Design a protein around this ligand. Structure first.
Ligand SMILES: Nc1ncnc2c1ncn2[C@@H]1O[C@H](COP(=O)(O)OP(=O)(O)OP(=O)(O)O)[C@@H](O)[C@H]1O
Ligand SMILES: Nc1ncnc2c1ncn2[C@@H]1O[C@H](COP(=O)(O)OP(=O)(O)OP(=O)(O)O)[C@@H](O)[C@H]1O
Ligand SMILES: [Zn+2]
Ligand SMILES: [Zn+2]
Lengths: 464, 465
RNA sequence: GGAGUAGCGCAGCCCGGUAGCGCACCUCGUUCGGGACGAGGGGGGCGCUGGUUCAGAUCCAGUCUCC
């Protein structure tokens, strides 16, 4: 057996690594998947981090209904309940594709004065956006995510919120997933329908395609107006609130897999990996007892350092087999504990990134955290390298067509949907975002030639 | 203040306290609710506790699909059905999961091959839909959050041990965290889970006398294994079906918390699951608003340092007496009253939602609270116990029975026949709560039909939620 | 033009005989420092619907499905 190399067929690589690492499996219903323990463990760590962040910024979790009145909101990407309770529903119900509406409805009745603001809500849950074609974590009918919703008195506080969150998403990606990203602004064609504008963080997968890791929307008074959400300000004036919306789904897991995965399988970032150190004991019948005891002692010492450790006791498998399994599963470090090692009060530390090294057993606990960090740092620097190595400034549409086969294309655009739409029908590439810290440039649209829009180059790429 | 007293109309008391304490609100769709922050905070603490307990017992969370193939369930009333999706009409209509046994079975069928593949120790935190067009927050709603565990074993014994391991967890959650007393027992054939061999449960008594099923744990034998073809080759070369179990606890547990300890002043939350354990209320006047608030702010840090979940109520817009009532309504166990005066004397007033009032040095507080919170929990539980005892009654005649099922628990003898049981329910509207595990050995005659007593002990009866 | 046969990958159909092989899985022993070895085993009735036949993955007719 093996594993289709990325260069041969990335899509297959992806699908197989997901299956073999037991991250997920396919559900009986088309477009639906089953997230197995190891994969779900990753999602939990993401929840934990984001949740802490959201909390430190005054948000509070709540839980709104799965079912939304159709009238609020048959659209294609919508699953509809029509039968329920045996009889046929008066009005057909939609399975939430997002929660803005229902929350708006409730906000309408909860918000009265400026004392009811700001509204800082977050909800962890599932949503359904129909798709009969499957692709684990990247595009599925049902999927888990976190969707935040806030309501403000002023348009300024709202926008500061929109940014605050995108930065959180970015911190999650950079300091925890070691996934580099571009903080930017979607174009009119690419933004959220009901939003005024949409901010996003874009990542580059090892296959060159781009991925939207998370979005943060400024909704202005669209929903306030649509759902009548007003309040009496301090100046005794009854005005409309300004709402924002932000969300990150398990697609972020897909990003992790496609940003660091190699031909041996997964490579999970230390800060989010279910298992950080996997201990693989190595023995013969006469060594087993004493060797396993050491392993368990080591397991304790590591658990104490607050590390996430796993001891692979499975006796039905050989050391070499295990070495592979865990490399497949992306565990950052492996500790090989054999009789020779045990004899010399040492052990071997093999890094998923590459290399083995011998160290004494007692030193191991204190030394792993730092090594784990160094591990993180490396992963990130390599991803960075990869990104730069695949981002390119295109001036001639011919250069553009070439660069969007490799990765990011930094071109100019007229800011015309019609043109944008054409570039996609042609090269399939799309607008990823108008980067915020992007250098100021003025030129002419790469495909139609009309004066450059956005006063800076737009990030283009074939995306997921 | 207009909180309908429990004795006047419990149902209204319940509904209003939920509204006023901002635990939840009604959603636009019939039977659906919205869990507001404060209420959801409670659910989160429950998750936290249960999950640590599930984890220490080797379970692992996973996430299975919301949509289940109708054929798997073979439209049954309690189901919500998707028929339209993607614009076109579905080939086969999809059911919104009312529970996950089936889909997990399907998956288990393909994952399990060897005994080395068992046990399967799975748990899933999520939502499920069981249609109901009539609403009652946390007690009975169309959609609701819960935790549903599923395990697969090689032997029936390991499976049954799992079934009791979990019910005990549920019971520990109720007793050591919710301070809600409960009876660990076994449902009767009429009252068990359809697909289960047998059903274990924990039963609680609400302040209105009605009973509530806080959590269940089922032994499914080989029903699903067989239904979904879940076999494996054992150490003995023999191929066989696995033995699966199932257990679940929903946010109905919140309803239990509300109805077990709630009083006419409103909620009374058990300290171990309360989102706010201590509320600081600074009392002052402009010429002291600076020093009081300074101390209050300081005490806040001192308390957070202790890991205590505290909330400071600065709200200058409101009067002390107003805040006092709000926090008694929302159930906060303790209140610290920090006044202009007592700060120079260095003392403060600690007031417990249970009638305690004491003065203590601000310095002693941080350290003293933890133990007090414990003493609190104990008392909550003590009272609930007392209530239940005062509302449980051994009956030997069907007249006494009818009387006792108006007050609470009725400990009657039964024949063991579903027919009689369904009769007792048609007449008295009472049902079987459970056949207690630790009940005292007793033989007698069915409280209604006269025939010799089954179970070898008294069955717990009651009007239930 | 091919192909739907065990979880996965395949052969068997021409010249009908009651289903086979690799991987995986179960047993036992030997192994164990980079995916072990031997022997012994378990699991499907061949996409679906007809038909011919003593007998049908195999022959005939037809239908569905992926390239
Ligand atoms: N089908 C899907 N499967 C998984 N995650 C998704 C899916 N669609 C969107 N997401 C995630 O949900 C987040 C918020 O949803 P949003 O509506 O902003 O995205 P979207 O426009 O649906 O994205 P795309 O169309 O690129 O999938 C996205 O940033 C992404 O992480
Ligand atoms: N409609 C509901 N709303 C909230 N929680 C519920 C609801 N139905 C059941 N639960 C919770 O889910 C747990 C497991 O559900 P299960 O299918 O065993 O219940 P059930 O037999 O339908 O309940 P009951 O006996 O109360 O009708 C119950 O112990 C309870 O805590
Ligand atoms: Zn153009
Ligand atoms: Zn009887």
């Amino acid at each position: 057996k093996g594993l289709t190399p990325q260069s041969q067929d990335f899509s297959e690589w992806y699908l197989e690594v997901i299956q073999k690492a037991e991250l997920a499996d396919y559900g009986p219903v088309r477009g639906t998947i089953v997230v197995r323990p190891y994969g779900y463990a990753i999602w939990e760590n993401i929840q934990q981090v984001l949740d802490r962040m959201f909390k430190e910024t005054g948000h509070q979790n709540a839980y709104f209904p799965l079912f939304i009145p159709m009238s609020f909101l048959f659209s294609p990407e919508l699953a509809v309940v029509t039968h329920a309770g045996g009889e046929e529903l008066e009005e057909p119900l939609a399975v939430r594709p997002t929660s803005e509406t229902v929350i708006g409805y409730m906000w309408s009745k909860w918000i009265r004065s400026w004392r009811d603001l700001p509204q800082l809500l977050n909800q962890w849950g599932n949503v359904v956006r129909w798709e009969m074609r499957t692709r684990p974590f990247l595009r599925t009918s049902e999927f888990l995510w976190q969707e935040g919703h806030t309501a403000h008195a002023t348009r300024e506080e709202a926008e500061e919120e929109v940014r605050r969150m995108l930065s959180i998403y970015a911190r999650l990606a950079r300091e925890y997933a070691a996934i580099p990203v571009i903080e930017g602004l979607k174009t009119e064609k690419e933004k959220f329908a009901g939003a005024v504008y949409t901010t996003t963080i874009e990542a580059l997968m090892k296959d060159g395609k781009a991925l939207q890791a998370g979005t943060s929307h400024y909704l202005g008074e669209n929903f306030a107006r649509a759902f009548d959400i007003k309040f009496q300000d301090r100046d005794l004036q009854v005005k409309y609130v300004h709402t924002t919306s932000w969300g990150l789904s398990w697609r972020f897991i897909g990003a992790i897999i496609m940003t660091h995965g190699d031909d041996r399988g997964l490579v999970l970032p230390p800060r989010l990996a279910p298992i950080q150190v996997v201990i693989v004991p190595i023995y013969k019948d006469e060594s087993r007892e004493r060797v396993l005891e050491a392993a368990q002692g080591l397991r304790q010492a590591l658990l104490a350092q607050g590390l996430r450790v796993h001891l692979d006791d499975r006796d039905q498998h050989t050391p070499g087999y295990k070495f592979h399994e865990w490399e497949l599963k992306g565990v950052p470090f492996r500790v090989e504990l054999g009789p020779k090692d045990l004899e010399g009060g040492q052990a071997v530390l093999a890094s998923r990134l590459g290399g083995k090294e011998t160290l004494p057993l007692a030193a191991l606990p204190e030394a792993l955290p730092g090594k784990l960090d160094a591990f993180h740092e490396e992963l990130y620097r390599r991803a960075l390298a990869f990104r730069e190595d695949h981002t390119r400034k295109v001036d001639t549409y011919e250069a553009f067509k070439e660069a969007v086969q490799e990765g990011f294309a930094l071109a100019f655009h007229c800011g015309d949907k019609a043109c944008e739409r054409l570039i996609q029908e042609e090269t399939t590439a799309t607008t990823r975002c108008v980067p915020f810290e992007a250098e100021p440039e003025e030129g002419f649209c790469v495909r139609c030639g009309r004066p450059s829009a956005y006063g800076k180059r737009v990030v283009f790429a074939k995306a997921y």
